[PDB]
Design a protein around this ligand. Structure first.
Ligand code: COA
Ligand code: COA
Lengths: 462, 462
């Protein structure tokens, strides 16, 4: 109670990994023969990262883990919990976490709690919560928790294909952190839904109910925001503060980003929530011109274009200040599934100084289809001095745009053939990848071979 | 540290579910045309539970959860964490947890942390630890944690098939419990191994390296017990107690049970550890006659039959007192994968009075191939009085043997055809199970249909 208060448990370090090639969305429009703007404006997407046959879920996760450890000058004996959130499943029993133990062998540190945890795009967040809970528990042994969220997002040909991507994020979690989980403020919602699911074991691709997935994302947002607000209101009331939480109480607001347009719609949806919750709508200058919508219900408006147009316009400045910068990775790389929202976090840390971040609340909406969601928040430390934790974490990401721009664009036809071959190779054993090793970023782990018994071997590109 | 001391976090209720049919191992021997005793003595197995087409991982988990909630007169509003451990994967994205939310819709309690967590036979224990950590964290909100471990264990034709099984266990976890997690005593070991894994997406069956699987189990046991002993020694020493931990410090010792014989070997393996760790072996009467093995090394004796024979004989009384009773569910139902060790816990609770359990330490070895393992312990309350929580939890399981005996034996050829049809139905969509609803135990959830879009619908047998 005062024990938890001392700890300031949070994110101490954040490492992001994405492959060295992408397909350009304007080029993909031409290739797919669609009208100009359908992807770049309609979806709001510029470039989509993809993998050659040299990278898989294990190599992505090994890559981001080792890059974090080296960047941060960490011994492998300083990790007490290691866990993977993913929905890229290449083995139904053997966890990615057990594969990652290869990296820990030389240290002899094998007493490391955690395995893998999966529900669509939400597994990273699940692992984060497990890590925080563990640090705060009787079982914490003074060591860091390490969370890895990683995924390869690929869709069948059609209108979902432009919304894939690939990436991994590693989060080092411990006490006295610069980005502190705001205690007791997890607004969670889970529900039995078939919006997006992967029951077809013969294919890498999901079954997607596109329209239902949008409705589920938005209804989950409504519910999570309401639970989050109820929880903060109760804390505030104890402290003698009877005000209502609104978007202005977030300094930044980040989202799981399937594509940028939905995120812009989602911030507008949060404003609509604020609007409906304020009994003094018609006397607040923030809501000027929205009087025609005073009586609408959330459940009736998931696809109401009038409400949408009005609230996107009314939230444009809030979107620019709180959310637009967070979309760097999404716009330039696509949907990284479990790591997407953490890519949005990385994007904020990459583009704002410690002084611009100090003391701010970062709202985090994490969604996974099926469905599981939580809106939670982080509080940034007030220490923005040089050499501070906040300075180190921002300095660790300030080259993010430059890293993204160092990738190579690949023509849509070449990308398309990569996808086709990936399908064809999906169940294959006794094979050796043919993709370039040299084109991988420095320090990237890659697949060497899959043997006749499905066992995989990895090596590190120097 | 006084915050965690007050809590006495532990298991407050334990529900087990198994299907209503099994195949008899003596009949299976005759069917497979093997020598009499191969299964019943060699593996130590009497009966193996199996499912008709009416049950799947979702239905098993729904069944055990709702049975627990009803037995215990619990509101669905009193659950704050719900998580599933399993390795029975019928969807690569959509968690069993999200399916379970069907049961919580009526109450409106959707703010429930947790999803699914997987590594082979270990996922149940991972979820247990997540639940305990959560209760002890800043995020606990006063509600119970509920953990569900469930699986369908099936092997291809051959020497592994008699070691399958099926079942689920739900554990209700909260403060001031009758079975208390002994704090700070998790002896964990994880390692990158290919002993048993499920990379073949076209088949329900695992790739098993049988010999490697036994070696990995035993080496993991050695390491886990060593870490466990190191941790408890430090704890005792801070309290003023300098004694070495031995098997006599466990009142009961329970194990993940792939088959009973390996559990018997495993207790013997633990006594071999005690033997080698004891500097006065030759003066202690339990080790009398074992002087020839004084200089052996653990890593050289995984399949040494002389060591095995000697330590099996020497540990026979310890086995009878601490472990034999725990194998009721394993012997009568087979390997339940993630729930196997919790079935062994259930078996101890089913067969011992509160007075016989009171104050005792229950050692718990949980293993999952790949591999992840932990040896931990529970402490039973000293309160064995009439109407006590210990009275309550034992009373909830004392009909376990009669429940097992109420099942129907099915002939091996019928069992074989069930398995064959299961393989053939594995990827099928747009189908309606043909198995009997009336033969299911009262209150069992079952599969109604899998539609053309792979969506599954369930109903409950009254
Ligand atoms: C998201 C998804 C459903 C969209 O597919 P779609 O709706 O068939 O694609 P459409 O092209 O019809 O419409 C998408 C946008 O492009 C706009 N658009 C279409 N052509 C355009 C053009 N030439 N220029 C500019 N915009 C254009 C549409 O108006 C729409 O935007 P709006 O809602 O702001 O008006 C599909 O990508 C998908 O299923 N993705 C995977 C699941 C997912 O990401 N779900 C999100 C919730 S998790
Ligand atoms: C466990 C497993 C490896 C055993 O298969 P197997 O070794 O081919 O079966 P075997 O018959 O050779 O040996 C099993 C036992 O039966 C004994 N046995 C064989 N015939 C017998 C008979 N007619 N009467 C009595 N015992 C007999 C063997 O001696 C052996 O026991 P022992 O080690 O105490 O001497 C196999 O069932 C398997 O792969 N299971 C799945 C993996 C698993 O559960 N692993 C455990 C670790 S997780």
């Amino acid at each position: 109670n005062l024990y938890f208060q001392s700890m300031d448990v949070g994110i101490v370090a954040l490492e992001i990994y994405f492959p060295s090639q992408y397909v350009d969305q304007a080029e993909l429009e031409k290739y797919d023969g669609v009208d100009a703007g359908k992807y770049t404006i309609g979806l709001g997407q510029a470039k989509m990262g993809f993998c050659t046959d040299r990278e898989d879920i294990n190599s992505l996760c090994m890559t981001v883990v080792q890059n974090l450890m080296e960047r941060n000058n960490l011994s492998y004996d300083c990790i007490g919990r290691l866990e993977v959130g993913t929905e890229t499943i290449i083995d139904k029993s053997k966890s990615v976490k057990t594969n990652l133990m290869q990296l820990f062998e030389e240290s002899g540190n094998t007493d490391i709690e955690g395995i893998d945890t999966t529900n669509a795009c939400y597994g990273g967040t699940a692992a984060v919560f497990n890590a925080v809970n563990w640090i705060e528990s009787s079982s914490w042994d003074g060591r860091y928790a390490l969370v890895v969220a990683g995924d390869i997002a690929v869709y069948a040909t059609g209108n979902a294909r432009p919304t894939g991507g690939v990436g991994a994020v590693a989060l080092l979690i411990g006490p006295n952190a610069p980005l502190i989980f705001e205690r007791g403020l997890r607004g969670t919602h889970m529900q039995h839904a078939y919006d997006f699911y992967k029951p077809d074991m013969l294919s890498e691709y999901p079954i997607v109910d596109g329209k239902l997935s949008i409705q589920c994302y938005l209804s989950a947002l409504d519910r999570c925001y309401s639970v989050y607000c109820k929880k903060i209101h109760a804390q505030w009331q104890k402290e003698g503060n009877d005000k209502d939480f609104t978007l202005n109480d977030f300094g930044f607001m980040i989202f799981h980003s399937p594509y940028c347009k939905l995120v812009q719609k989602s911030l507008a949806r949060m404003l609509l929530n604020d609007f409906l919750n304020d009994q003094n709508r018609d006397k607040n200058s923030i809501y000027s011109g929205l009087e025609a919508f005073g009586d609408v219900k959330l459940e009736d408006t998931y696809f109401d274009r009038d409400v949408e147009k009005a609230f996107m316009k009314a939230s444009s400045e809030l979107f620019s200040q709180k959310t637009k910068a967070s979309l760097l990775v999404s716009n330039q790389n696509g949907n990284m599934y479990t790591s997407s929202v953490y890519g949005s976090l990385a994007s904020v840390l990459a583009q704002y100084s410690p002084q611009q971040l100090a003391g701010k609340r970062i709202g985090v909406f994490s969604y996974g289809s099926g469905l599981a969601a939580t809106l939670y928040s982080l509080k940034v430390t007030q220490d923005a001095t040089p050499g501070s934790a906040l300075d180190k974490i921002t300095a660790s990401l300030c080259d993010l745009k430059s890293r993204l721009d160092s990738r190579t664009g690949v023509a849509p036809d070449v990308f398309a053939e990569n996808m086709k071959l990936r399908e064809d190779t999906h169940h294959l054993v006794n094979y050796i990848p043919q993709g370039s090793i040299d084109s991988l970023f420095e320090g990237t782990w890659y697949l060497v071979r899959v043997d006749e018994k499905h066992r995989r071997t990895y090596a590190r590109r120097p």
